[PDB]
Design an enzyme around this catalytic site. Structure first.
Site, PDB file in Angstrom:
ATOM      1  N   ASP A  83       9.099 -10.200   4.088  1.00 50.88           N
ATOM      2  CA  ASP A  83       8.612  -9.331   3.125  1.00 50.88           C
ATOM      3  C   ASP A  83       9.640  -8.879   2.160  1.00 50.88           C
ATOM      4  O   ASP A  83      11.052  -8.531   2.493  1.00 50.88           O
ATOM      5  CB  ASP A  83       7.842  -8.130   3.473  1.00 50.88           C
ATOM      6  CG  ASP A  83       7.444  -7.212   2.584  1.00 50.88           C
ATOM      7  OD1 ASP A  83       6.495  -7.466   1.825  1.00 50.88           O
ATOM      8  OD2 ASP A  83       8.254  -5.761   2.662  1.00 50.88           O
TER       9      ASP A  83
ATOM     10  N   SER B 268      11.211  11.004   2.200  1.00 53.86           N
ATOM     11  CA  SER B 268      11.779  12.217   1.004  1.00 53.86           C
ATOM     12  C   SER B 268      12.965  12.962   1.542  1.00 53.86           C
ATOM     13  O   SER B 268      12.794  13.676   2.658  1.00 53.86           O
ATOM     14  CB  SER B 268      10.956  13.367   0.756  1.00 53.86           C
ATOM     15  OG  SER B 268      11.421  13.969  -0.392  1.00 53.86           O
ATOM     16  N   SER B 269      14.089  12.680   1.033  1.00 49.51           N
ATOM     17  CA  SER B 269      15.425  13.376   1.565  1.00 49.51           C
ATOM     18  C   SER B 269      15.328  15.068   1.442  1.00 49.51           C
ATOM     19  O   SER B 269      15.620  15.639   2.652  1.00 49.51           O
ATOM     20  CB  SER B 269      16.703  13.117   0.832  1.00 49.51           C
ATOM     21  OG  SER B 269      17.937  13.482   1.235  1.00 49.51           O
ATOM     22  N   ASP B 270      14.759  15.673   0.484  1.00 53.19           N
ATOM     23  CA  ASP B 270      14.726  16.941   0.402  1.00 53.19           C
ATOM     24  C   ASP B 270      13.421  17.518   1.043  1.00 53.19           C
ATOM     25  O   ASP B 270      13.491  18.756   1.318  1.00 53.19           O
ATOM     26  CB  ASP B 270      14.850  17.376  -1.263  1.00 53.19           C
ATOM     27  CG  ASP B 270      14.088  16.789  -1.764  1.00 53.19           C
ATOM     28  OD1 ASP B 270      14.287  15.618  -2.212  1.00 53.19           O
ATOM     29  OD2 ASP B 270      13.328  17.497  -2.708  1.00 53.19           O
TER      30      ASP B 270
ATOM     31  N   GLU C 160       8.699 -13.496   0.703  1.00 52.98           N
ATOM     32  CA  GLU C 160       7.972 -13.022  -0.619  1.00 52.98           C
ATOM     33  C   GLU C 160       8.857 -12.755  -1.836  1.00 52.98           C
ATOM     34  O   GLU C 160       9.520 -12.033  -1.695  1.00 52.98           O
ATOM     35  CB  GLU C 160       6.938 -12.087  -0.220  1.00 52.98           C
ATOM     36  CG  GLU C 160       6.328 -11.708  -1.778  1.00 52.98           C
ATOM     37  CD  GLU C 160       4.842 -11.005  -1.545  1.00 52.98           C
ATOM     38  OE1 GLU C 160       4.598 -10.493  -0.391  1.00 52.98           O
ATOM     39  OE2 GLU C 160       4.116 -10.968  -2.576  1.00 52.98           O
TER      40      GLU C 160
ATOM     41  N   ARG D  23       7.580 -14.798   8.185  1.00 52.76           N
ATOM     42  CA  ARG D  23       6.964 -14.592   6.724  1.00 52.76           C
ATOM     43  C   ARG D  23       7.898 -13.355   6.479  1.00 52.76           C
ATOM     44  O   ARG D  23       7.645 -11.928   6.652  1.00 52.76           O
ATOM     45  CB  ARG D  23       5.627 -14.347   6.607  1.00 52.76           C
ATOM     46  CG  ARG D  23       5.084 -14.702   5.121  1.00 52.76           C
ATOM     47  CD  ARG D  23       5.596 -13.856   4.013  1.00 52.76           C
ATOM     48  NE  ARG D  23       5.240 -12.434   4.295  1.00 52.76           N
ATOM     49  CZ  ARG D  23       5.140 -11.704   3.217  1.00 52.76           C
ATOM     50  NH1 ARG D  23       4.879 -12.183   1.774  1.00 52.76           N
ATOM     51  NH2 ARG D  23       4.747 -10.401   3.311  1.00 52.76           N
TER      52      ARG D  23
ATOM     53  N   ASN E 200      15.403   2.353  -3.995  1.00 49.48           N
ATOM     54  CA  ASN E 200      13.954   2.449  -3.276  1.00 49.48           C
ATOM     55  C   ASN E 200      12.956   1.552  -3.756  1.00 49.48           C
ATOM     56  O   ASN E 200      12.661   1.507  -5.118  1.00 49.48           O
ATOM     57  CB  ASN E 200      13.586   3.830  -3.036  1.00 49.48           C
ATOM     58  CG  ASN E 200      14.508   4.535  -1.878  1.00 49.48           C
ATOM     59  OD1 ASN E 200      15.462   3.688  -1.177  1.00 49.48           O
ATOM     60  ND2 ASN E 200      14.457   5.740  -1.683  1.00 49.48           N
ATOM     61  N   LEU E 201      11.830   0.872  -2.970  1.00 47.53           N
ATOM     62  CA  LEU E 201      10.794   0.461  -3.415  1.00 47.53           C
ATOM     63  C   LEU E 201       9.635   1.572  -3.572  1.00 47.53           C
ATOM     64  O   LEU E 201       9.464   1.741  -2.347  1.00 47.53           O
ATOM     65  CB  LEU E 201      10.385  -0.735  -2.611  1.00 47.53           C
ATOM     66  CG  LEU E 201      11.146  -2.171  -3.024  1.00 47.53           C
ATOM     67  CD1 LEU E 201      10.554  -3.167  -2.195  1.00 47.53           C
ATOM     68  CD2 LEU E 201      11.220  -2.249  -4.418  1.00 47.53           C
TER      69      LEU E 201
ATOM     70  N   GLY F 223      -9.978  -1.268  12.545  1.00 49.18           N
ATOM     71  CA  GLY F 223      -9.890  -1.552  14.112  1.00 49.18           C
ATOM     72  C   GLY F 223      -9.687  -3.105  14.261  1.00 49.18           C
ATOM     73  O   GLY F 223      -9.499  -3.537  15.519  1.00 49.18           O
TER      74      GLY F 223
ATOM     75  N   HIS G 197      -2.774 -10.779  -0.475  1.00 51.11           N
ATOM     76  CA  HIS G 197      -3.063  -9.297  -0.427  1.00 51.11           C
ATOM     77  C   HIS G 197      -2.386  -8.642  -1.821  1.00 51.11           C
ATOM     78  O   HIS G 197      -2.602  -7.497  -2.107  1.00 51.11           O
ATOM     79  CB  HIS G 197      -2.318  -8.708   0.694  1.00 51.11           C
ATOM     80  CG  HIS G 197      -0.789  -9.209   0.892  1.00 51.11           C
ATOM     81  ND1 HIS G 197      -0.377 -10.347   1.193  1.00 51.11           N
ATOM     82  CD2 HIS G 197       0.240  -8.684   0.549  1.00 51.11           C
ATOM     83  CE1 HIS G 197       0.849 -10.620   0.662  1.00 51.11           C
ATOM     84  NE2 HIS G 197       1.332  -9.443   0.486  1.00 51.11           N
ATOM     85  N   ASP G 198      -1.751  -9.132  -2.562  1.00 47.66           N
ATOM     86  CA  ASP G 198      -1.222  -8.603  -3.814  1.00 47.66           C
ATOM     87  C   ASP G 198      -1.721  -9.371  -5.085  1.00 47.66           C
ATOM     88  O   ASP G 198      -0.971  -9.050  -6.186  1.00 47.66           O
ATOM     89  CB  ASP G 198       0.560  -8.837  -3.828  1.00 47.66           C
ATOM     90  CG  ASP G 198       1.079  -8.105  -2.604  1.00 47.66           C
ATOM     91  OD1 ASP G 198       0.495  -6.852  -2.389  1.00 47.66           O
ATOM     92  OD2 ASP G 198       1.978  -8.326  -2.172  1.00 47.66           O
TER      93      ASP G 198
HETATM   94 CA    CA Z   1      -9.102  -2.452  18.026  1.00 41.87          CA
END
Ligand code: CA
Ligand SMILES: OC[C@H]1O[C@H](O[C@H]2[C@H](O)[C@@H](O)[C@@H](O)O[C@@H]2CO)[C@H](O)[C@@H](O)[C@@H]1O
Ligand SMILES: OC[C@H]1O[C@H](O[C@H]2[C@H](O)[C@@H](O)[C@@H](O)O[C@@H]2CO)[C@H](O)[C@@H](O)[C@@H]1O
Ligand SMILES: OC[C@H]1O[C@H](O[C@H]2[C@H](O)[C@@H](O)[C@@H](O)O[C@@H]2CO)[C@H](O)[C@@H](O)[C@@H]1O
Ligand code: CA
EC number: 2.4.1.19
Length: 686
Positions: free
Chosen positions: A229, A145-147, A257, A227, A193-194, A51, A327-328
């Site tokens: 990413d 996902s492509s498929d 980053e 920032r 892809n990541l 929230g 966060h990492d």
């Molecule tokens: Ca809220």
């Protein structure tokens, strides 16, 4: 306005950034909370929305939490609309609470707030001298996902509500369809892809133009910085072209980053920070601070080598965004750890070069392993912690003591456990002594500083067991005991007489764009500004005051220039190097050369007739080029930022060290597009 003004979007070196995971900070408006399976109001399940919103940030900005700590900037989660799917990853529900799964970069994530909420956030923050940085993640959309098109939202991309496309049936080629990266090479991590994130194709003109327009909307909303990413995962040339679109429009402080592991020092990382038009999160600084202060895997000599090495490796080390966790990473503070380790790491970061960033809740000693355990809701808003007080005492010095914001860094005393360093800028000095040894004091003798004669009280006031320092003639400090786990800050401030440049921003733009030169001693009357040997004065100097100059870049040839100013009396300042004048607006163009066979250790590079291609100087060629993913050796390719609409002549080179082999024959030619992207494909000419 003064360099220290909230209005200064080009320089964050006098600020202290507080990184906020919006969802986990403060839910100021329960009405916008996600519902059902996507929500956990108690925030026990760290993978769902708890929230936290923009109204909550506005609240904490208005009730003194951030201001009382001396925080002067906030960096918040990506504000754009994210997918709404609850993705089940092997029995576990996952939501877009983090803001990294974009669906529409032209709209807001309604969980955070509306556009109006964002405008209010910007206004509330500015009224309190707090700058606002937004995360921007143009590398991908969301899991796809492509498929199996029914999975998630199939990485679908919208343009202010209008569907552009999804990962399945990507006939337009909005995304890359090369599999996922194993992070094995930089090229591999850029064009694959990541994880399962649908990788955007910046070589697709629609994607290009769209992302550049989307950022303009945010700039218009009043953000002060960006920032970026996953910068190690997008073509460097496209990103340079993206930084040019920002700078040639409304420049704002941008840092990306680019993760570095323990003991990793990457020349690629340095060149990126040195040439892309954006700086970086200082992982080299952060990982070394953790080894020395947290994990005990290196000592002061290693902290010192990082300080000296980085000052040398980064052209603008003062633009690097330092931190002790994020966060990492696992939270700096281990549940069982002595809090002094965190306090010290904090004091060190706050008084060191660059732009300090504090992960929300550090001042509250939050502990937690990796994702999502490092992302818990902040448990307290107490100003009474030692950590909060350290920030409160030290954060403000970046504004009042320019030695800390822009000074050089010098080791004055050192052993395995102790480091005493000095920051200096004009007539300003700051000396910091740190004793990581939590059980053994140190006897300090022979310490010499640039501090004037006198007695100096610890700025921290003994909070971290620091002491008073007595400096004699020669800046020699009389002997003293540096307590176990002791940390002390001593400073000297006074008006600077000679013009001294402490910062320049942006560092790359086309002629006519206004740059901000900050420092001390410029005086109140307009002087002269130099770009290389070219002098600029009068009308093009938009404004001039002792700490800040605003000036338009002259119409000189594209290239790299050293900036220097002189006061009205003609006294020259120090030189701030590496300013890049662009040749005009930029577009991202992919160059492809076929049949360019090389010997092992030899690579292909591009050179050409514009500064953007190094002006035929092999020392400045573009590369090394790629040859694995989109094209395979002996064909090479590379995405390069070049001046829009220009007719450019180019050639390819085979280089090993500084030894160079030129393509034979005539130069190739092409005319860059006026907007969007292009691809030029030629054969290597023997
Ligand atoms: Ca809220
Ligand atoms: O006095 C000048 C000297 O100060 C520092 O030397 C320290 C050294 O770091 C300590 O480990 C110990 O040996 O005390 C020395 C001073 O008495 C600086 O490190 C050094 O460069 C400087 O010359
Ligand atoms: O993958 C990039 C790689 O390209 C160049 O190596 C070529 C090599 O010259 C050929 O002999 C053959 O072995 O293919 C290589 C690419 O797989 C560079 O020599 C090399 O340094 C670079 O990593
Ligand atoms: O140095 C300026 C010059 O650079 C390039 O010329 C190359 C040429 O293509 C090579 O075949 C070889 O002869 O080295 C020259 C550089 O010394 C550009 O082709 C040329 O236009 C430019 O003026
Ligand atoms: Ca990518």
């Amino acid at each position: 306005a003064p360099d220290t003004s909230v209005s200064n979007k080009q320089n964050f070196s006098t600020d202290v950034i507080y990184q906020i995971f919006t969802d986990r900070f403060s839910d100021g408006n329960p009405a916008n909370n996600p519902t059902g399976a996507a929500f956990d109001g108690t925030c026990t399940n760290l993978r769902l929305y708890c929230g936290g919103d923009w109204q909550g940030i506005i609240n904490k900005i208005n009730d003194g939490y951030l201001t009382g700590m001396g925080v002067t900037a906030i960096w918040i989660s990506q504000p754009v609309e994210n997918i709404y799917s609850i993705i089940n990853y092997s029995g576990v529900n996952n939501t877009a609470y983090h803001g990294y799964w974009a669906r529409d970069f032209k709209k807001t994530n309604p969980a955070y707030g509306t556009i109006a909420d964002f405008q209010n956030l910007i206004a509330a923050a500015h009224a309190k001298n707090i700058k606002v940085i937004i995360d921007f993640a143009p590398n991908h959309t969301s899991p796809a996902s492509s498929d199996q098109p029914s999975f998630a939202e199939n990485g679908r991309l919208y343009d202010n509500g209008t569907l552009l496309g999804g990962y399945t049936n990507d006939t337009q080629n909005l995304f890359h369809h090369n599999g996922g990266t194993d992070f094995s090479t930089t090229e591999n991590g850029i064009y694959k892809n990541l994880y399962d994130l649908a990788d955007l194709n910046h070589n697709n003109s629609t994607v290009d133009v769209y992302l550049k327009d989307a950022i303009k909307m945010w700039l218009d909303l009043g953000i002060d910085g960006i920032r970026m990413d996953a910068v190690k995962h997008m073509p460097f040339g496209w990103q340079k072209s993206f930084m040019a679109a920002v700078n040639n429009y409304k420049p704002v402080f941008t840092f990306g980053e680019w993760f570095l592991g323990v003991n990793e020092v990457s020349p690629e990382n340095h060149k990126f920070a040195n040439e892309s038009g954006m700086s970086l999160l200082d992982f080299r600084f952060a990982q070394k601070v953790r080894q020395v202060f947290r994990d005990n895997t290196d000592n002061m000599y290693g902290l010192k080598a990082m300080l000296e090495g980085s000052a040398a490796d980064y052209a603008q080390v003062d633009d690097q965004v330092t931190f002790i966790d994020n966060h990492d990473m696992e939270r700096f503070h281990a549940s069982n750890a002595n809090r002094r380790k965190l306090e010290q790491a904090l004091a060190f970061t706050l008084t060191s070069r660059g732009v300090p960033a504090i992960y929300y809740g550090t001042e509250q000693y939050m502990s937690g392993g990796t994702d999502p355990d490092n992302r818990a809701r902040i448990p307290s808003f107490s100003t009474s912690t030692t950590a909060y007080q350290v920030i409160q005492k030290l954060a403000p010095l970046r504004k009042c003591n320019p030695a800390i914001a822009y000074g050089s860094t010098q080791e004055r005393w050192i052993n395995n456990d102790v480091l005493i360093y000095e920051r200096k800028f004009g007539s300003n000095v700051a000396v910091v002594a740190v004793n990581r040894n939590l059980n053994a004091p140190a006897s300090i003798s022979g310490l010499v500083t640039s501090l004037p004669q006198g007695s100096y009280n610890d700025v921290l006031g003994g909070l971290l067991n620091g002491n008073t320092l007595s400096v004699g003639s020669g800046g020699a400090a009389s002997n003293f005991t540096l307590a176990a786990g002791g940390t002390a800050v001593w400073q000297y401030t006074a008006a600077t007489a000679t013009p001294t440049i402490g910062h320049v921003g942006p560092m790359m733009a086309k002629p006519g764009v206004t740059i901000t030169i900050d420092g001390r001693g410029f005086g109140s009357s307009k002087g002269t500004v130099y770009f290389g040997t070219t002098a600029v004065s009068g009308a093009d100097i938009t404004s001039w005051e002792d700490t800040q100059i605003k000036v338009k870049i002259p119409a000189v040839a594209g290239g790299n220039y050293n900036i220097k100013v002189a006061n009205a009396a003609g006294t020259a300042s120090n030189v701030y190097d590496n300013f890049e004048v662009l040749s005009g607006d930029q577009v991202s163009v992919r160059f492809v050369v076929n049949n360019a066979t090389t010997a092992l250790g030899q690579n292909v590079y591009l050179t050409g007739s514009v500064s953007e291609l190094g002006n035929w100087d092999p020392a400045k060629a573009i590369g090394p080029m790629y040859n694995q993913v989109v094209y395979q050796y002996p064909n090479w390719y590379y995405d390069v930022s070049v001046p829009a609409g220009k007719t450019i002549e180019f050639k390819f080179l085979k280089k090993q060290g500084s030894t160079v082999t030129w393509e034979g024959g005539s130069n190739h030619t092409f005319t860059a597009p006026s907007s969007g992207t292009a691809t030029i494909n030629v054969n290597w000419q023997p």
